[PDB]
Amino acid sequence: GITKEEVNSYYQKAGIVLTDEEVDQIQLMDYGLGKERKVGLQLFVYVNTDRYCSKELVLFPGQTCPEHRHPPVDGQEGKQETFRCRYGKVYLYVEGEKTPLPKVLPPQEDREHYTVWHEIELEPGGQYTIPPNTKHWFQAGEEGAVVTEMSSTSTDKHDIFTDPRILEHHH
Amino acid sequence: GITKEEVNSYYQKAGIVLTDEEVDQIQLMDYGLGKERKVGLQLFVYVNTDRYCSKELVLFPGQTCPEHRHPPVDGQEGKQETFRCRYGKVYLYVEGEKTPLPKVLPPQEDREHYTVWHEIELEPGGQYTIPPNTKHWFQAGEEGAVVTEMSSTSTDKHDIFTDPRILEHHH
Ligand SMILES: [As]
Ligand SMILES: [As]
Ligand SMILES: [Zn+2]
Ligand SMILES: [Zn+2]
């Protein structure tokens, strides 16, 4: 199974230093789907204030983060988040015109729970800003990925997942 | 003289990848003081939206960023900013009780224009959040430093420098 130490090995690939205490604060998400290396996300929250947040994400090789959106909370538009690939490769899919031939697909057994198909390919240095309240999902290439998130305040509990099988306590 | 390529060499020390286009967007600040390697700052802005901002800062060995504060703009408290050392060492001085014996001092010829003395020493992985509208300055150790800034929206032009000799067009 996935461990926090294994996630930290990817931070180290990217040259990103966490203290021992911080490694213990890494979050492992499997979304209750029982297939963590295929569908899951791992992250470390640097900071989350009433105005801004940053996280360092790790995806293992071929791992997919399932489709979700960040809805308005407290009268704003929803979380806007900027994703910057630090290591590896990530295929990000966002609302927009469907890419006719995508480079990767979500897991076949869950595919009906993915609805957006506009492809953004990110290698290290690549960056993209996902607009508030828009559906998105992403999958790492065969070396995995480390991705920085820079955003407005995060409230994971309000995130809305396309797959109805994914519950609030899963985020 | 300092060049953008030289600044990028420090990003590379920290494992941080910028594209060629991004290297060209690095900002070099000397604050009009004519001693860039002693008093100055270099940075790359990843993103700056109406809600959040992130920058990657470089300080050369022994270089000091002069004292300033981020005042309220638009009815909020002022920019709150989280500083995380990625490489090297930085000595950060913030409002608070004066550290009786600091590890470093600002340039002797400008020292009267530094007024806060509460010392925070950061090595890689170290992080500190500078509260809104509070004076702060910082200086790298003998290997220099790379420091990530994560903050609310940045508006450099409204920053207030303690040294009256530093002008608006210098930031
Ligand atoms: As997320
Ligand atoms: As700054
Ligand atoms: Zn998201
Ligand atoms: Zn500042």
Side-chain angles (χ1 to χ4, degrees):
Chain A
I2 293 170
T3 62
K4 295 170 180 169
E5 296 64 35
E6 186 181 2
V7 177
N8 191 43
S9 71
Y10 272 75
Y11 295 139
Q12 297 170 321
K13 294 182 191 196
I16 297 172
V17 175
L18 274 57
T19 67
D20 292 348
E21 176 171 4
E22 291 174 329
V23 168
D24 189 50
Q25 300 169 346
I26 287 169
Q27 303 177 10
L28 307 180
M29 268 80 71
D30 65 26
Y31 301 104
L33 294 180
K35 50 202 190 190
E36 63 184 359
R37 293 184 186 276
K38 183 180 292 179
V39 182
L41 183 59
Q42 297 80 202
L43 65 77
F44 173 70
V45 181
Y46 293 115
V47 62
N48 190 19
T49 76
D50 290 350
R51 284 188 286 180
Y52 65 87
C53 174
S54 185
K55 311 182 190 180
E56 204 69 66
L57 312 179
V58 169
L59 280 181
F60 294 110
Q63 186 180 36
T64 297
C65 176
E67 186 177 284
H68 62 281
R69 62 179 167 98
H70 305 296
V73 175
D74 296 352
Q76 93 244 146
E77 221 313 46
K79 187 184 72 172
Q80 175 191 47
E81 65 182 355
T82 301
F83 265 12
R84 184 181 183 90
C85 180
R86 305 297 194 162
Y87 172 87
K89 184 171 177 165
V90 57
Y91 301 92
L92 169 65
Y93 294 86
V94 299
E95 293 186 18
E97 297 304 309
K98 300 190 180 198
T99 298
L101 195 65
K103 299 290 198 291
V104 301
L105 295 179
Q108 72 189 17
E109 67 281 9
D110 296 330
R111 207 167 282 154
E112 66 268 39
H113 302 297
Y114 294 79
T115 67
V116 303
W117 293 96
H118 184 72
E119 183 176 83
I120 302 299
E121 189 166 339
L122 305 177
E123 304 211 63
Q127 186 176 291
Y128 190 84
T129 295
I130 303 169
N133 201 27
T134 68
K135 294 181 289 174
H136 54 288
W137 62 273
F138 50 97
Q139 180 185 118
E142 294 203 341
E143 296 176 339
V146 179
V147 179
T148 307
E149 175 189 328
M150 301 158 324
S151 66
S152 54
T153 301
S154 181
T155 49
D156 287 4
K157 73 190 168 84
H158 301 299
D159 288 350
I160 296 170
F161 285 75
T162 304
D163 188 338
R165 306 171 301 168
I166 297 172
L167 309 185
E168 173 173 342
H169 77 267
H170 294 137
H171 48 107
Chain B
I2 293 170
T3 62
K4 295 170 180 169
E5 296 64 35
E6 186 181 2
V7 177
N8 191 43
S9 71
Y10 272 75
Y11 295 139
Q12 297 170 321
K13 294 182 191 196
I16 297 172
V17 175
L18 274 57
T19 67
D20 292 348
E21 176 171 4
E22 291 174 329
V23 168
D24 189 50
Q25 300 169 346
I26 287 169
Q27 303 177 10
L28 307 180
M29 268 80 71
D30 65 26
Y31 301 104
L33 294 180
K35 50 202 190 190
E36 63 184 359
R37 293 184 186 276
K38 183 180 292 179
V39 182
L41 183 59
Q42 297 80 202
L43 65 77
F44 173 70
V45 181
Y46 293 115
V47 62
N48 190 19
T49 76
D50 290 350
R51 284 188 286 180
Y52 65 87
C53 174
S54 185
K55 311 182 190 180
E56 204 69 66
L57 312 179
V58 169
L59 280 181
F60 294 110
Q63 186 180 36
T64 297
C65 176
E67 186 177 284
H68 62 281
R69 62 179 167 98
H70 305 296
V73 175
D74 296 352
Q76 93 244 146
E77 221 313 46
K79 187 184 72 172
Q80 175 191 47
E81 65 182 355
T82 301
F83 265 12
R84 184 181 183 90
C85 180
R86 305 297 194 162
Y87 172 87
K89 184 171 177 165
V90 57
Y91 301 92
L92 169 65
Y93 294 86
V94 299
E95 293 186 18
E97 297 304 309
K98 300 190 180 198
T99 298
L101 195 65
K103 299 290 198 291
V104 301
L105 295 179
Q108 72 189 17
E109 67 281 9
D110 296 330
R111 207 167 282 154
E112 66 268 39
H113 302 297
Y114 294 79
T115 67
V116 303
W117 293 96
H118 184 72
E119 183 176 83
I120 302 299
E121 189 166 339
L122 305 177
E123 304 211 63
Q127 186 176 291
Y128 190 84
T129 295
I130 303 169
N133 201 27
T134 68
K135 294 181 289 174
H136 54 288
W137 62 273
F138 50 97
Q139 180 185 118
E142 294 203 341
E143 296 176 339
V146 179
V147 179
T148 307
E149 175 189 328
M150 301 158 324
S151 66
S152 54
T153 301
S154 181
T155 49
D156 287 4
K157 73 190 168 84
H158 301 299
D159 288 350
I160 296 170
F161 285 75
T162 304
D163 188 338
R165 306 171 301 168
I166 297 172
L167 309 185
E168 173 173 342
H169 77 267
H170 294 137
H171 48 107

Short mmCIF file of all heavy atoms in Angstrom, two decimals, chain B residues 31 41 43 55 57 65 68 70 79 81 83 136 138 149 154 156 159, ligand 2:
data_model
loop_
_atom_site.label_atom_id
_atom_site.label_comp_id
_atom_site.label_asym_id
_atom_site.label_seq_id
_atom_site.Cartn_x
_atom_site.Cartn_y
_atom_site.Cartn_z
N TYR B 31 16.16 48.70 -5.92
CA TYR B 31 15.58 49.73 -5.06
C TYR B 31 16.17 51.14 -5.28
O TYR B 31 15.98 52.02 -4.47
CB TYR B 31 15.60 49.27 -3.59
CG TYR B 31 14.82 48.00 -3.44
CD1 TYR B 31 15.48 46.78 -3.30
CD2 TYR B 31 13.45 48.01 -3.48
CE1 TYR B 31 14.76 45.58 -3.24
CE2 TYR B 31 12.73 46.81 -3.41
CZ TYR B 31 13.40 45.61 -3.29
OH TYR B 31 12.70 44.44 -3.21
N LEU B 41 16.60 42.35 -4.65
CA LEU B 41 15.76 41.13 -4.63
C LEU B 41 15.57 40.74 -6.07
O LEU B 41 15.53 41.59 -6.96
CB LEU B 41 14.42 41.43 -4.00
CG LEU B 41 13.42 40.26 -3.83
CD1 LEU B 41 14.05 39.16 -2.98
CD2 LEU B 41 12.11 40.76 -3.26
N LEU B 43 13.09 37.96 -8.48
CA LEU B 43 11.93 37.06 -8.35
C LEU B 43 11.27 36.76 -9.67
O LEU B 43 11.50 37.40 -10.69
CB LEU B 43 10.94 37.64 -7.37
CG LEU B 43 10.24 38.92 -7.71
CD1 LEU B 43 9.13 38.71 -8.74
CD2 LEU B 43 9.65 39.57 -6.39
N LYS B 55 5.23 33.66 -5.81
CA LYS B 55 6.47 34.11 -6.42
C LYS B 55 7.59 33.21 -5.96
O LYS B 55 7.53 32.65 -4.86
CB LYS B 55 6.80 35.56 -6.04
CG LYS B 55 5.67 36.52 -6.24
CD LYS B 55 6.05 37.96 -5.91
CE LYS B 55 4.89 38.89 -5.87
NZ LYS B 55 5.33 40.27 -5.54
N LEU B 57 11.45 33.65 -5.02
CA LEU B 57 12.46 34.69 -4.75
C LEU B 57 13.85 34.08 -4.76
O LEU B 57 14.06 32.95 -4.28
CB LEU B 57 12.22 35.27 -3.35
CG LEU B 57 10.79 35.68 -2.99
CD1 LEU B 57 10.73 36.21 -1.57
CD2 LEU B 57 10.22 36.66 -3.98
N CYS B 65 17.04 42.21 1.45
CA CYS B 65 15.85 42.86 0.91
C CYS B 65 15.43 43.88 1.98
O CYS B 65 15.25 43.50 3.15
CB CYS B 65 14.74 41.82 0.66
SG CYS B 65 13.18 42.59 0.10
N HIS B 68 10.03 46.60 4.53
CA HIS B 68 8.80 47.13 3.96
C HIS B 68 7.61 46.45 4.61
O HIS B 68 7.77 45.51 5.40
CB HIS B 68 8.79 46.86 2.45
CG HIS B 68 8.82 45.40 2.10
ND1 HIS B 68 9.97 44.66 2.14
CD2 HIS B 68 7.82 44.54 1.79
CE1 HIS B 68 9.68 43.40 1.82
NE2 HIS B 68 8.37 43.30 1.60
N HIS B 70 3.20 45.54 3.78
CA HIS B 70 2.12 45.43 2.78
C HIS B 70 0.85 45.95 3.41
O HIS B 70 0.25 45.26 4.25
CB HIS B 70 1.96 43.96 2.38
CG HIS B 70 3.24 43.36 1.88
ND1 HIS B 70 3.87 43.80 0.72
CD2 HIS B 70 4.04 42.41 2.40
CE1 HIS B 70 4.99 43.12 0.55
NE2 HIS B 70 5.13 42.29 1.57
N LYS B 79 -1.50 42.50 2.39
CA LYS B 79 -1.06 41.18 1.92
C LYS B 79 -0.48 40.38 3.07
O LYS B 79 0.39 40.86 3.79
CB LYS B 79 -0.05 41.36 0.80
CG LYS B 79 0.31 40.06 0.14
CD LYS B 79 1.40 40.18 -0.95
CE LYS B 79 2.80 40.46 -0.36
NZ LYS B 79 3.89 40.41 -1.35
N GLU B 81 1.67 37.07 3.74
CA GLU B 81 2.51 36.25 2.89
C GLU B 81 3.28 35.23 3.68
O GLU B 81 3.85 35.50 4.76
CB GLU B 81 3.38 37.10 1.98
CG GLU B 81 4.33 37.90 2.71
CD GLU B 81 5.21 38.82 1.80
OE1 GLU B 81 5.14 38.76 0.56
OE2 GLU B 81 6.00 39.58 2.34
N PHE B 83 6.33 32.60 3.66
CA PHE B 83 7.65 32.44 3.09
C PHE B 83 8.16 31.07 3.41
O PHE B 83 8.19 30.69 4.57
CB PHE B 83 8.65 33.38 3.74
CG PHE B 83 8.85 34.67 3.03
CD1 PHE B 83 8.02 35.08 2.00
CD2 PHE B 83 9.90 35.46 3.37
CE1 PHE B 83 8.23 36.30 1.36
CE2 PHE B 83 10.14 36.66 2.74
CZ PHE B 83 9.30 37.10 1.75
N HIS B 136 8.93 44.09 7.72
CA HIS B 136 9.84 42.94 7.69
C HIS B 136 10.97 43.21 6.70
O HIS B 136 10.82 43.99 5.75
CB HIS B 136 9.10 41.64 7.27
CG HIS B 136 8.33 41.74 5.98
ND1 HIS B 136 7.17 42.47 5.87
CD2 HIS B 136 8.53 41.15 4.77
CE1 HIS B 136 6.71 42.37 4.64
NE2 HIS B 136 7.51 41.58 3.95
N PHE B 138 14.81 40.91 5.19
CA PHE B 138 15.45 39.57 5.24
C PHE B 138 16.78 39.59 4.53
O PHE B 138 17.00 40.46 3.68
CB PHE B 138 14.49 38.45 4.81
CG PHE B 138 13.78 38.71 3.51
CD1 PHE B 138 14.26 38.17 2.33
CD2 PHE B 138 12.60 39.44 3.47
CE1 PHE B 138 13.58 38.38 1.12
CE2 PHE B 138 11.91 39.65 2.26
CZ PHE B 138 12.41 39.13 1.08
N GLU B 149 7.26 32.56 -2.04
CA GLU B 149 6.23 33.39 -1.43
C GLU B 149 4.85 32.84 -1.88
O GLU B 149 4.60 32.61 -3.09
CB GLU B 149 6.40 34.82 -1.91
CG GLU B 149 5.29 35.71 -1.42
CD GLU B 149 5.30 37.10 -2.05
OE1 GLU B 149 6.42 37.59 -2.37
OE2 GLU B 149 4.20 37.73 -2.19
N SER B 154 -0.92 40.29 -4.89
CA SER B 154 0.21 41.21 -4.72
C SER B 154 -0.02 42.50 -5.49
O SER B 154 -0.53 42.49 -6.62
CB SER B 154 1.49 40.52 -5.21
OG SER B 154 2.61 41.37 -5.03
N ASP B 156 2.69 45.30 -5.63
CA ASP B 156 4.01 45.84 -5.27
C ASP B 156 3.99 47.37 -5.17
O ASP B 156 4.66 47.93 -4.34
CB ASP B 156 5.09 45.42 -6.28
CG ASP B 156 5.50 43.95 -6.17
OD1 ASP B 156 4.92 43.18 -5.38
OD2 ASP B 156 6.46 43.57 -6.88
N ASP B 159 3.35 48.80 -1.72
CA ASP B 159 4.21 48.45 -0.60
C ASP B 159 4.93 49.68 -0.05
O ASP B 159 5.29 50.57 -0.80
CB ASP B 159 5.27 47.45 -1.04
CG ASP B 159 4.67 46.08 -1.30
OD1 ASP B 159 3.49 45.87 -0.95
OD2 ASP B 159 5.42 45.22 -1.81
AS AS C 2 7.84 40.85 -1.61
#
